[PDB]
Amino acid sequence: VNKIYIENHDLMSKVPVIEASKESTRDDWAALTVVADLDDIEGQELVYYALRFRKSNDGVRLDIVHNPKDTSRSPSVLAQRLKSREDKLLDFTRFLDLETALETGEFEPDVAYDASLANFLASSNMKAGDNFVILNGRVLGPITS
Numbered sequence: 001v002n003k004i005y006i007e008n009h010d011l012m013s014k015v016p017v018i019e020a021s022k023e024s025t026r027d028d029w030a031a032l033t034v035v036a037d038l039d040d041i042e043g044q045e046l047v048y049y050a051l052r053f054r055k056s057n058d059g060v061r062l063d064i065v066h067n068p069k070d071t072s073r074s075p076s077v078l079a080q081r082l083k084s085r086e087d088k089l090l091d092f093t094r095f096l097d098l099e100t101a102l103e104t105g106e107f108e109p110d111v112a113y114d115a116s117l118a119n120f121l122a123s124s125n126m127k128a129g130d131n132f133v134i135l136n137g138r139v140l141g142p143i144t145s
């Protein structure tokens with residue numbers, strides 16, 4: 001059950017995270033990962049829905065894995081842009097706010113991060129560009145077009 005979470009600590013340590021509230025209960029806890037291609041509106045839309053879900057459900061730990069189909073730009077670039085605005089993620093009220101968060105910010109590519117992402121996909125039998133979620137170890141998707 002756990003294996004997806006054990007084999008990918010390096011990746012999962014670097015992605016944007018909204019932790020479960022401290023004041024939330026153990027029974028309200030859930031672990032939701034959204035894996036989506038943030039180069040495209042459909043992937044962005046899925047993350048936006050997940051942000052809205054977390055805003056209203058504060059026992060949820062949400063983390064976000066940018067999973068582009070095209071890797072000409074390092075997958076770590078949008079990841080770092082979003083990571084740099086982690087404290088703002090629950091202040092978003094508008095889809096445009098997420099778009100804006102992804103649009104600018106100069107970051108060196110993280111070569112090790114990119115390799116950890118490729119490894120995560122391979123070992124999870126998913127493809128670059130696929131949009132999916134992991135809920136308490138259950139992988140659901142891909143969610144097609």
Ligand SMILES: CCCCCCCCCCCCOCCOCCOCCOCCOCCCCCOCCOCCO
Pocket residue numbers: 027028029030032046049050053057059133135143
């Ligand atoms: C096409 C797909 C579109 C996707 C939309 C955007 C993606 C985000 C949406 C994903 C949401 C999926 O999950 C929804 C369910 O979660 C709702 C929030 O609730 C989380 C809580 O879940 C807890 C699960 O329950 C397990 C706890 C069991 C506890 C048992 O307690 C008994 C103890 O009692 C005796 C003790 O004295």
